[PDB]
Structures are given as structure tokens and as C-alpha cells.
Design an enzyme around this catalytic site. Structure first.
Site: not given
Ligand code: HEM
Ligand SMILES: Nc1nc(OCc2ccccc2)c2[nH]nnc2n1
Ligand SMILES: [Ca+2]
Ligand code: HEM
Ligand SMILES: *[C@@H]1O[C@H](CO)[C@@H](O[C@@H]2O[C@H](CO)[C@@H](O[C@@H]3O[C@H](CO)[C@@H](O)[C@H](O)[C@@H]3O)[C@H](O)[C@H]2NC(C)=O)[C@H](O)[C@H]1NC(C)=O
Ligand SMILES: Nc1nc(OCc2ccccc2)c2[nH]nnc2n1
Ligand SMILES: *[C@@H]1O[C@H](CO)[C@@H](O)[C@H](O)[C@H]1NC(C)=O
Ligand SMILES: *[C@@H]1O[C@H](CO)[C@@H](O)[C@H](O)[C@H]1NC(C)=O
Ligand SMILES: *[C@@H]1O[C@H](CO)[C@@H](O)[C@H](O)[C@H]1NC(C)=O
Ligand SMILES: *[C@@H]1O[C@H](CO)[C@@H](O)[C@H](O)[C@H]1NC(C)=O
Ligand SMILES: *[C@@H]1O[C@H](CO)[C@@H](O)[C@H](O)[C@H]1NC(C)=O
Ligand SMILES: OC[C@H]1O[C@H](O)[C@@H](O)[C@@H](O)[C@@H]1O
Ligand SMILES: OC[C@H]1O[C@H](O)[C@@H](O)[C@@H](O)[C@@H]1O
Ligand SMILES: OC[C@H]1O[C@H](O)[C@@H](O)[C@@H](O)[C@@H]1O
Ligand SMILES: C[C@@H]1O[C@@H](O)[C@@H](O)[C@H](O)[C@@H]1O
Ligand SMILES: C[C@@H]1O[C@@H](O)[C@@H](O)[C@H](O)[C@@H]1O
Ligand SMILES: [Ca+2]
Ligand SMILES: [Cl-]
Ligand SMILES: [Cl-]
Ligand SMILES: [Cl-]
Ligand SMILES: [Cl-]
Lengths: 104, 466, 103, 465
Positions: C94-96
Site C-alpha cells: 500500500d505504502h509503495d
Molecule cells: C491503501 C491503504 C490506505 C490509504 C492510504 C492513502 O492513500 O493515504 C490506508 C489508510 C490508513 C489510514 C488513514 C485513515 C484515514 O483515512 O484518515 C490509517 C490511519 C491507517 C492505519 C493503518 N493501516 Fe491502513 N490503509 C491502507 C491499506 C492497509 C493495508 C492493506 C493490506 C493494511 C494491512 C493496513 C494496515 C494498517 C495499520 C497496521 C498497523 C495501520 C495502523 N493498511 N491506514
Molecule cells: N494515509 C495513511 N495514514 C496512516 O497513518 C497516519 C500517518 C500519516 C503520516 C505519517 C504517519 C502516520 C497510515 N498507517 N498505515 N497506512 C496509513 N496510511
Molecule cells: Ca511506487
């Protein structure tokens, strides 16, 4: 959008209930293909001297016109199956569909 | 910078440069004026620049009623409860309505004849005075609205103005849809592409995006290939009319004075019905009246519309011929030989390669009109695809599409199926002999003409409210 | 975009030669469907008190979470065919792919 | 602002209001903070509001190398011509590299342990410290890049820093692609959807749009249903590892101190390999560690990730469940009973309808993770479609895709097919026993584990000039 209307609005607003601006006036066109600009996001091809498009020099619009579009007026061919009205309705219709503003 | 006078390339000007040995513009320090279309998101360097549509995309006759509240209001006669559109208060056309005058800061119509002093017309869309042939159509539709509104009034005396305007507008909109889809598009696309892109209507689909696609604003410009270099005016016997029965087009642009002072819209409508269109041909693409002399009478220099068409596609960041071919599912020629096959024309293919270097770079308009026409249509596969696709979205994605259940009654739909552009012309002019269906085909008097009396009128019975 | 290259740019610029910003960073997402806003262009559903979505009251996100997502932790079912490493790679990947900035 | 501390709905704030009788938040005047995503065209009343992606869409390990030039330089070790990534100068992990510390203005990691004063890490993506399990993965990839550059230096002594960096970066990018498309996606989508949405690669197609689709940033959050409520740390024996073997998740968020001061990445990597994921079930969707207590230690109040997901989809103007079904060519249930058929769960369908009134209004995340799972996949038909579609574009639309002609040589491609995540862990950690392929399926020690010596290393011979 009102729960229940009867006639089109003027702007087109509310024709599509889920996405109210679709077809409404003064909105961005939709794209069917991603745009292709000299800098990938705003400058049109032909803008910067010497800058090729996809491996080839951009041709001057006027030049293409001179070389491909130009013909002697006396050669003109009447369409035996279309009236000029066929032309005119097209332009009238075009003008129901789109107008692209530019700066004054 | 002023794009009208300067040849300096500075936002928002994107002037066309002049090649050597140009047949008309010998000064290479010169240029053809060009303003870039307004960006949907000014300044952005995050957003891929896109352009704006000021009109409703729906086929709703917004070119009569306007696309914004203030204007739509100004176009309406609000002196009474008759739901009429405002008509010209200074001049009439043999006793019949003309369009009101507009009040432009810089009126280009005034420039076409100084002494006549006739300003541009005011209509739903700003381009109504662009050529008198266009003006006559606008004026025709105005008349039909009021004619409709006057009939309805007689039927439903209790209906107020708002009700009368809407109901008449609703009808005019359907008429436009009907003429366009029943009569016009089939002769643009041909029966095959017609089947393919416009299969039998079913009903409204709220998931169909009705917006005009950017590429359409350029591809539907194919129409420029149909333009004759004269405006043709005929008398009630369909003979050349004096004065000046064949005006060069370069002397009709913005010439609203010709409608007002040279006999109204009758001679022009007859000219349209009984003169043939130009046929697009691979070596006869578009006439010099628009290629050399567009707007001559109101600009510092004459414009080249085809060239503008091509500069405009670059301004709009439109992909080349081949990307669109691919989008449409058509083969994408790579070599001059392969292009020759697509075009059934090796000479033209060569010329195109010589200009563009690759079919990838051919400008959509140029590529579009180069293709041999489809049988019984007037575009090739590429433009049929683009144009066909757009109109299906406008139809299937319009909640107020005339055949859509609930919009009109069944009886009203049956009555509406009876309408035609020729009837509309019989009901609103001094013309008593008109084209046979199909009006877009008929073009030879008197072979393709009938008496008005032979055509049934729109019957508004089913609009009666108890 | 250079005529010949050998490695990715850092930003993603020029991966697609015909449209050199596609997949590059700090650009608009592409949409696969027209967006749906309370006002058609900007305000999110649930923004204005009492404004319904498509004929029905917008559900508080927190209530849906309370009523549908919430469960007793001790009911947790471990995945017999997936490791926690399967969850982790998803986040790493996701983070890629996307990060959506906020103020 | 201030979205962190006010409940006034004032742009850019869009706080989540609290329903009556909430099980946690008793203050009806309080709320869960929330910031609208930055608009692509700020202010405009002409363009339908859209959002921004700060990252490169391509699977190119940008979370390792960064998506912007300046950051990507700061991540590089430029004291020399070895093309290495900068490593931490203050601490090491039993003698192995750790991510450099970042220099944040407002640093959340510091908050998780007052006395420790350990700041967040610096990586390709800014979320690297969000949980130590994520941090461990970043660190893993950091060493692997350095391991490769180092080994490339021996093969090619004449290569300068830039060359070694790019060459190693290219390998790392290819590994991510391979692990993802070979090992990961098939287990997400299931074999049926794998074939439907990811047919066999042909080659680069420059008319395939590689951008991430707005709906994807929301749908790929399905992952949240896989999250366990603890961080599991095991020892060299794969036995619970003291001090704290099972740390509640609400005490690992931004807890970079745990990595530096509580044993480094090995115990965390072993916990990931030998602990099962949570399974998504229609009455056990996501755990309270993320639903009640998300970021508890670093904010005035605990967040609700699943609720955030749903508020975010509205923020983004995302169409509802049925529109997405239709987009994917799947039937659109109109009634409760129809929704019950689609979910093969009447009770869940009634709950959803109670909440939304219409299946057209169900938020994409909610509706997506509600569907029964595809055979040998972990998402339903709707999410597989969206997810499958996104990854096909990232593959076919990537000029630098690892299999694309001209990218690597034939023999390089042959060699890369040998890489595996387990091997990467063997090469960059003190772990000598790891998961059987497929690492994402194996989860039980010692049934599903092998000795590192059985896995072949990546052979770099064909990178020799
Ligand atoms: C993809 C994916 C996103 C969107 C990323 C982007 O485009 O910014 C996402 C979002 C988040 C968020 C943002 C919440 C908000 O909308 O305000 C948080 C706080 C968060 C936290 C954690 N996530 Fe998640 N997430 C995406 C995918 C995934 C996946 C996919 C397999 C996993 C697993 C995962 C896990 C976690 C995680 C584990 C410690 C935290 C904390 N995220 N995500
Ligand atoms: N968009 C988003 N956000 C998160 O946290 C909030 C966060 C934003 C900037 C730096 C650290 C933490 C996530 N944690 N895992 N995936 C995330 N995606
Ligand atoms: Ca990339
Ligand atoms: C459709 C259509 C457009 C684009 C509409 C829009 O602005 O979105 C169009 C363009 C023009 C232009 C602008 C040139 C530029 O880009 O700078 C001019 C000056 C012009 C003039 C005339 N056109 Fe045309 N055109 C469209 C469609 C058609 C059709 C369709 C069948 C016909 C026929 C037609 C005819 C004429 C015309 C006849 C007198 C003039 C003058 N136009 N158009
Ligand atoms: C490279 O990939 C693209 C996209 O996946 C392929 O182009 C696409 O091809 C399809 C099928 O021809 C096109 O579908 C067609 O769309 C038109 C317009 O709506 C429609 O009339 C047809 O019925 C058909 O569905 C699609 O538009 C087109 N997409 C793009 C972006 O051009 C292309 O074929 C691929 N190239 C190769 C060699 O596989
Ligand atoms: N965009 C555009 N422009 C034209 O003229 C220029 C024009 C613009 C505004 C008012 C009057 C005249 C057209 N004539 N026919 N289609 C046209 N489209
Ligand atoms: C309004 O309608 C009345 C009656 O037809 C007419 O006398 C008047 O001229 C109209 N006004 C305009 C501006 O057309
Ligand atoms: C301008 O209009 C007047 C009045 O109709 C006419 O006599 C004159 O010929 C027109 N000008 C030109 C150049 O035709
Ligand atoms: C409505 O149109 C869309 C777009 O082509 C399509 O997904 C959907 O199947 C259509 N619905 C019907 C009933 O035709
Ligand atoms: C850069 O590399 C050298 C040699 O490996 C190392 O000693 C130094 O600490 C590195 N610097 C950073 C910031 O990682
Ligand atoms: C913070 O970390 C230190 C190690 O420096 C540890 O001893 C202490 O228990 C931690 N404090 C908390 C509250 O976890
Ligand atoms: O998006 C424009 C158009 O392209 C072509 C087909 O994919 C159509 O279904 C689609 O409507
Ligand atoms: O024909 C290929 C393709 O082109 C377009 C549409 O008409 C599709 O129905 C058709 O499948
Ligand atoms: O638009 C994205 C995705 O939507 C659907 C299909 O039309 C696909 O071929 C396409 O790529
Ligand atoms: C207008 C409709 O839009 C979508 C297409 O999938 C359908 O085939 C139809 O073309
Ligand atoms: C990735 C490609 O994109 C486009 C579609 O027409 C193709 O089938 C494919 O999905
Ligand atoms: Ca319209
Ligand atoms: Cl377009
Ligand atoms: Cl007047
Ligand atoms: Cl989307
Ligand atoms: Cl440091």
C-alpha cells in the site's frame, strides 16, 4: 436536488441525481484518454521550438493546412445526397452541446 | 499581451506560426491569432490541464433557452403570462418574429456593415450571429416555441406563463432530439455505425456519464468539410434571388444585417434545402473561404479554421490519430504503406507522413476527415466511433430523454413521432413548398420537394388538461 | 522526457512517454467513476444536517462501525492459511502505491 | 485548524459525530477528529473535487527510495561512491543497520515513551514508524539494498556510486514486484480472479493508464480486517519472547522505541512469520485495538479506523456499493433479501439496511469487506475486481516492469525468479530458520518452516560487465 422535479433545470444541474453536475454547464469536459502536453501537464505541442512529439518535429498547423487541406475552389464537389441543411443542423446541434470559453 | 494583435507567444496566446512559401501570408513575422481555451483549474501544476464546457451537454435546445439562469430569464418575455420568448422590438421579417438584439461591448456584427448598424442577435448560445444560415435556424426555433406556447394557451387557458414556457420548451427539446437521432445522425454515421453505437433505446440509465468528452469538441468539427463557399438565397419559386443570390461566406460572417435588411430567413432556409452540401473528399477537404478568409471582415487578418482546429487539439492536449484509433478498437497504422491501406490512398498517406512523421502524431481532426467515408455516412470509422459514442451517452444518460418513461405520456410520444424539420419550416415561415423526408438528403428542387399541405402538423390534443 | 534512459526517475515522471505525468507523484488520482458529493462537486455526504443521500439519511460512520464492525475480541478467528506477514506486506505494498495528503 | 481539538465542522475539518449510547465516548459534545484530504484544485467551483497521490503509483519500492528528488537524496549515503542508503548513526540491531532517525517538527513517536526519547524513522514513505512490524519491513529492505550494492561493488569495482545505487534500487524494485505478483496477489484474489484480472503478462502497453484510482486508496484498506490486536515477538526458538511477548496494538503505534530498545527487528519478523493473520468473518470484521484505540498514545482521543475509512470515502466523493458492483459487472442488489443473497448472510444484510436504507448507499469499504470471501482468496468479488483491476494497470502500464523487454537481460530475469521474502530475511537478519514458500501462507512453527541453508541465494553473476 429536489426530491421531485418536472422539467429540466436551465444549467442541467440535477439531471443525474447521484452526480448532479454531470451534463451541467460551466464544468470541465470529461476525458476519454489522458492528455498529452509537451510538459505532460499544460504546455501544448508546438510551444517550445525544437521540442519533438514522440520522436518527430511538430508540424505547423498552418503548414498541414497548406499541404493537405488546400484545394482549388473550382474542383469543389456537390454532395448528390446531402443538402446544405445537413451542414447547418450540425452547427446548430454542435451549439446545443459544447462551447469552450477562452479569455477576452 | 493581446492575442488579437501580438504575435508574441505569451499566456494566454498560442499563435499559429507561418511556414515559408505560404500562399497568402508572405510575412513570416506574422501569425494567425489564437487564445488558449480557459483552464478548468487556473495555475495548477498538480492537475493535468483540462478545458471547460459553458453549455449543457444534453440535447435540450439550450441553444434556444440558454444554459444559465440570468440569460434564460432575459431570453423570456415576462410582460405577461403567455410563456413566450422575447422577440425583436425594432424589426420584423415579413410580419414574423426575429431574434432580439444583444448588447455586446464589442459588437462584431456592427463591423460587417458600418452604415446598416445592425448588432448581433441575442439567443441561448452566443454564436447565433456567426453566419446567417445559423441565425435563421435559431430564429425558426424561437418562432416554434412561441407558436407552441400560443397553441397550448388556447388548449389550457388556466396555465400560467411559467407552465406555458416549460411545456413549450419541453416540446422544442424533444423535436431537436428527434430530428437529430431519427433524421440526422443516421446520415452522419451510416446504418452500420448507427446500429453499432446507437442500438434501440431502452430507457434511462443513471450510470451513463452524459458529459461531452474533450475530444468530441474537435471531432464533431468534421462538419467544416461540408461547408460551401457561398451563402445561397432563393425566391419563392426556388430561383436565384436578388440582390446577391450567392454571397461569398467571407462576407456573411457576423452579418446579421443581411437577415434584417435583405429579406429575412425565408430565402436562406430555401437556399439550405435546395442547394447541395459540399462532399468531403480526400483532395477536397475544406474550402478557402474558411481556410483563408474566416472572419476577414472583423479581424486584423483572415483566419484558417482547419489550422485552428489543429492548433486547438494541441491546446487541449488531445492524443494523436493512433491513440484514438486504439481507443476505438481500430487498427493503428505505423507505416506509410499501412496508412495507405487505412485510407485506400497512398498519395495522401505519403503527404501525412511527410507532415507528421508518424500516424501517432496526426492531429485527431486531420486524421478524422482524411478517412474515406462510411457507406451512406459522411465520416470514416474513427469519427463515427467518436461521434457515435458521444451521442449514445447523451441519449442513454439523459433523464429527460423524450422516450424515457414518465417524461411524456404515451399519447404525447405518439404525437411527437409525427414532427419534422420541414413541417416546422411550414408552420413558421412564408415558405409553402419544402423538402421531402429526409430533409438532410433532399437537395434538388423540385424533385425532392412537396407542398406543405401534404405534411401533418404536430397534434397537441394529448396536452389537454381537464 | 529524455530520448533514452536506463532507470526510473524518482518521481515516476516519464515512465509513460506520451503522457509523462501518469503514475508520477503529487498528481490527482484517476477516477473510474464520477464523484458523488452533497452539492455535486465538493461537500461530502453527511456534511449538512438532514440532507439525505439518494433518498435516505446518511449513516454516521461511527454508528456503522459500532453496529456492524464491532465484535468481542475473544471471538477472534485466526487464519489457518495466512500468516501475519500477509497483513504486513499488504500495508508495506500500500505504502509503495498511495499516500493521500491532508492539511 | 484545528481538527485535532475542535468539533466545529469548519473546512478543512470534517469531524465524526458520536451516536447516542456510544460504547466508548460518553461525551455527546465530543467527536473523532478528521481532516479532509487536500483538494487537487483548491477553491475551484468548476472541477469536481478530487484528491492527491503523493507517491509514485508504480510498484517500484518508492517506500524505500522516496517519491521526490530531495528526500531521495537525503536517504542516500553520499560520503562515498558505494551507492548505499544512509543508516542510523546512533544505534544498531545486534550489529545490523537501522533506519536513520527523522527530524520531525511534531514527532508522535517521542510520545509513546517519555523517558526513551526515541524519534520516528526516516524512510521512502513517511508512515514507516506507524507500527514496528511495518518498521521492520522497511529496515529489512534497507539492508537488502545495501547488501546488493555491496555485492555489486565486488562484481564491478569500476562502477561509481550513482551506478551502484540505481542498479541495486532496480533489483529491490523487481523483488517487490515479484513477491507481490507471484506470492501475494494470488492469495488476496483467489485463483479465479487471479486469472480474470491478471492474465499472463505479454509486455509493456503504453496506452494503459498506471495511475492509482481514487476508489483504490479506500478498497485496499480491506487489509484492516486482517489485523491482530497484538504485536507478537518471538525468540530464536520461536517461543514467546520476554519482556513483552504480546503487546496490545494500541501501545505499538509510532513506538519506534520498541525497535531500538526492545530487541530490534528479528523478534518482530519471527512473530510475523509464525503467527496467523486474523481471518475476516462477517461478524468479526475488525478489532477494537484499531476501532476503539487507534493512536491512543499520541492523540487526545482514540480513533476508529473503520469509521475513518468510511468518512474518508465520503470525503473523496466515492460512489456507493451498488455503483461499484455495476462498475465491475456484478449484480446490484436492490432489496434486503437480494442483499442477503449476495452476502449469503441475511442477518448482516439486515444490519446493513438498517444502517443505510439502501444498498446504493453502503460505503465501498464497508460493503467490500462484507462480502463472503472468494475461494482461496481473502476478498469478495467486488474488492477482487477493484483490486485486480488496479494491479493489472500497474503491471501492464509500467515501462520498467521487470519482465518487460530491455529492462533486464534474459539471464537476469532467470536469476530474479529465484528471489523470495524468506531468503531476504535470511540474508539480512540473524534469523536462520524461516517460513516455507509461500511465506504468506505458512504460519505455524515448525510445521511450515525450513532452514535458511535450503533456500538458494540470488545469483548476481549476470550483472557483471
Ligand atoms: C491503501 C491503504 C490506505 C490509504 C492510504 C492513502 O492513500 O493515504 C490506508 C489508510 C490508513 C489510514 C488513514 C485513515 C484515514 O483515512 O484518515 C490509517 C490511519 C491507517 C492505519 C493503518 N493501516 Fe491502513 N490503509 C491502507 C491499506 C492497509 C493495508 C492493506 C493490506 C493494511 C494491512 C493496513 C494496515 C494498517 C495499520 C497496521 C498497523 C495501520 C495502523 N493498511 N491506514
Ligand atoms: N494515509 C495513511 N495514514 C496512516 O497513518 C497516519 C500517518 C500519516 C503520516 C505519517 C504517519 C502516520 C497510515 N498507517 N498505515 N497506512 C496509513 N496510511
Ligand atoms: Ca511506487
Ligand atoms: C462542435 C464544434 C466546435 C467546438 C465548439 C466548442 O467551442 O466547444 C467548432 C469550432 C469552431 C470555431 C472555433 C475554432 C477554434 O478552435 O478557435 C470556429 C471559429 C467555427 C466556425 C464555424 N463552424 Fe465550427 N465547430 C463545431 C462544429 C461545427 C459543425 C458540425 C457539423 C459545423 C457544420 C460547423 C460550421 C462552422 C461555421 C459555418 C458558418 C463556422 C463559421 N461547426 N467553429
Ligand atoms: C493496450 O491496453 C488498452 C486498454 O486496456 C487497449 O485499448 C483498449 O482496447 C479496447 C478494446 O479494443 C477498447 O475498447 C473499445 O472502446 C471503444 C470506445 O468506448 C468501444 O467503442 C469498443 O466497443 C471497445 O470496447 C478501449 O477503448 C481501449 N482503451 C484505450 C485506453 O485505448 C489496447 O487494445 C491494448 N493494446 C494491446 C495491444 O493489447
Ligand atoms: N467556439 C466556437 N466559436 C465560434 O466562433 C467564434 C465566436 C465565439 C463566440 C461568439 C461568437 C463567435 C464558432 N462558430 N461555429 N462554432 C463555433 N464555435
Ligand atoms: C411580449 O409579448 C407581447 C404579446 O405578444 C408583445 O406585444 C411584446 O412585444 C412581447 N415582448 C417582447 C420583448 O418580445
Ligand atoms: C450596408 O447596408 C445598406 C443598407 O441595406 C446597403 O445598401 C449596403 O449595400 C450595405 N453595405 C454593403 C457593403 O453592402
Ligand atoms: C448502465 O450503463 C452502464 C455504463 O455502460 C453499465 O455499467 C450498466 O450495465 C448499464 N445498466 C443497464 C441496465 O444497462
Ligand atoms: C556511509 O557509508 C560508510 C561506509 O559504509 C559508513 O561508514 C557511514 O556510516 C555511512 N553513512 C551513513 C549516513 O549511513
Ligand atoms: C520506555 O523505555 C524504557 C527503556 O529505555 C523502558 O525501560 C520503559 O519501561 C519504557 N516505558 C514505558 C512506559 O513503556
Ligand atoms: O469511456 C468512453 C467509452 O470508451 C469506449 C468503451 O469503453 C465505452 O464503454 C466507454 O463508454
Ligand atoms: O467490436 C468490438 C467492440 O466495439 C465496440 C462495441 O460495439 C462492442 O460491443 C464491440 O464488442
Ligand atoms: O476504466 C477502468 C477499467 O474499467 C472497466 C473496463 O472498462 C476496463 O477495460 C478499464 O480499464
Ligand atoms: C452507454 C453505455 O455505456 C457503457 C457501455 O459499457 C455500454 O456498452 C454502453 O455503451
Ligand atoms: C489493462 C487493459 O486495459 C484496457 C482493457 O481494454 C484491457 O482489456 C486491459 O484490462
Ligand atoms: Ca444542451
Ligand atoms: Cl477526450
Ligand atoms: Cl431589440
Ligand atoms: Cl475512483
Ligand atoms: Cl541518525
Amino acid at each position: 436536488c429536489p426530491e421531485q422535479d418536472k422539467y429540466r433545470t436551465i444549467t442541467g444541474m440535477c439531471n443525474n441525481r447521484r452526480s448532479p453536475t454531470l451534463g451541467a454547464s460551466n464544468r470541465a469536459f470529461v476525458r476519454w484518454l489522458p492528455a498529452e502536453y509537451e510538459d505532460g501537464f499544460s504546455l501544448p505541442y508546438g510551444w517550445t521550438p525544437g521540442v519533438k512529439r514522440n520522436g518527430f518535429p511538430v508540424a505547423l498547423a498552418r503548414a498541414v493546412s497548406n499541404e493537405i487541406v488546400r484545394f482549388p475552389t473550382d474542383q469543389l464537389t456537390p454532395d448528390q445526397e446531402r443538402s446544405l441543411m445537413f451542414m447547418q443542423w450540425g452547427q446548430l446541434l454542435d451549439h446545443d452541446l459544447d462551447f469552450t470559453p477562452e479569455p477576452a | 499581451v493581446n492575442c488579437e494583435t501580438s504575435c508574441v507567444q505569451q499566456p494566454p496566446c498560442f499563435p499559429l506560426k507561418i511556414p515559408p512559401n505560404d500562399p497568402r501570408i508572405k510575412n513570416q513575422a506574422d501569425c494567425i491569432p489564437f487564445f488558449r481555451s480557459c483552464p478548468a483549474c487556473p495555475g495548477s501544476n498538480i492537475t493535468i490541464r483540462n478545458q471547460i464546457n459553458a453549455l449543457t451537454s444534453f440535447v435540450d435546445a439550450s441553444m434556444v433557452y440558454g444554459s444559465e439562469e440570468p440569460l434564460a430569464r432575459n431570453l423570456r418575455n415576462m410582460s405577461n403570462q403567455l410563456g413566450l420568448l422575447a422577440v425583436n422590438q425594432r424589426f420584423q421579417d415579413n410580419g414574423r418574429a426575429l431574434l432580439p438584439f444583444d448588447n455586446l461591448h464589442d459588437d462584431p456584427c456592427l463591423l460587417t456593415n458600418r452604415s446598416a448598424r445592425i448588432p448581433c442577435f441575442l439567443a441561448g448560445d452566443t454564436r447565433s450571429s456567426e453566419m446567417p444560415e445559423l441565425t435563421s435556424m435559431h430564429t425558426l426555433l424561437l418562432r416554434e416555441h412561441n407558436r407552441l406556447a400560443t397553441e397550448l394557451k388556447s388548449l389550457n387557458p388556466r396555465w400560467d406563463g411559467e407552465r406555458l414556457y416549460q411545456e413549450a420548451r419541453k416540446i422544442v427539446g424533444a423535436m431537436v432530439q428527434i430530428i437529430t437521432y431519427r433524421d440526422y445522425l443516421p446520415l452522419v454515421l451510416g446504418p452500420t455505425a448507427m446500429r453499432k453505437y446507437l442500438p434501440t433505446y431502452r430507457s434511462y440509465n443513471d450510470s451513463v456519464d452524459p458529459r461531452i468528452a474533450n475530444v468530441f469538441t474537435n471531432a464533431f468539427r468534421y462538419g467544416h468539410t461540408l461547408i460551401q463557399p457561398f451563402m445561397f438565397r432563393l425566391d419563392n419559386r426556388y430561383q436565384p434571388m436578388e440582390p446577391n443570390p450567392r454571397v461569398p461566406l467571407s462576407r456573411v460572417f457576423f452579418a446579421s444585417w443581411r437577415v434584417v435588411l435583405e429579406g429575412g430567413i425565408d430565402p436562406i432556409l430555401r437556399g439550405l434545402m435546395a442547394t447541395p452540401a459540399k462532399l468531403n473528399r480526400q483532395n477536397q477537404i475544406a474550402v478557402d473561404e474558411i481556410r483563408e478568409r474566416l472572419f476577414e471582415q472583423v479581424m486584423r487578418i483572415g483566419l484558417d479554421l482547419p489550422a485552428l482546429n489543429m492548433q486547438r487539439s494541441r491546446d487541449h492536449g488531445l492524443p494523436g490519430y493512433n491513440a484514438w484509433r486504439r481507443f476505438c478498437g481500430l487498427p493503428q497504422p505505423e507505416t506509410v504503406g499501412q496508412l495507405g491501406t487505412v485510407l485506400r490512398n497512398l498519395k495522401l498517406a505519403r503527404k501525412l507522413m511527410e507532415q507528421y512523421g508518424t500516424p501517432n502524431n496526426i492531429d485527431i481532426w486531420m486524421g478524422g476527415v482524411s478517412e474515406p467515408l462510411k457507406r451512406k455516412g459522411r465520416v470514416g470509422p474513427l469519427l463515427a466511433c467518436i461521434i457515435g459514442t458521444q451521442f449514445r451517452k447523451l441519449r442513454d444518460g439523459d433523464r429527460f430523454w423524450w422516450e424515457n418513461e414518465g417524461v411524456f405520456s404515451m399519447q404525447q410520444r405518439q404525437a411527437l413521432a409525427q414532427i419534422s424539420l420541414p413541417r416546422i419550416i411550414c408552420d413558421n415561415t412564408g415558405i409553402t413548398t419544402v423538402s421531402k423526408n429526409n430533409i438532410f438528403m433532399s437537395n434538388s428542387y423540385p424533385r425532392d420537394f412537396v407542398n406543405c399541405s401534404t405534411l401533418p402538423a404536430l397534434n397537441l390534443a394529448s396536452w389537454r388538461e381537464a
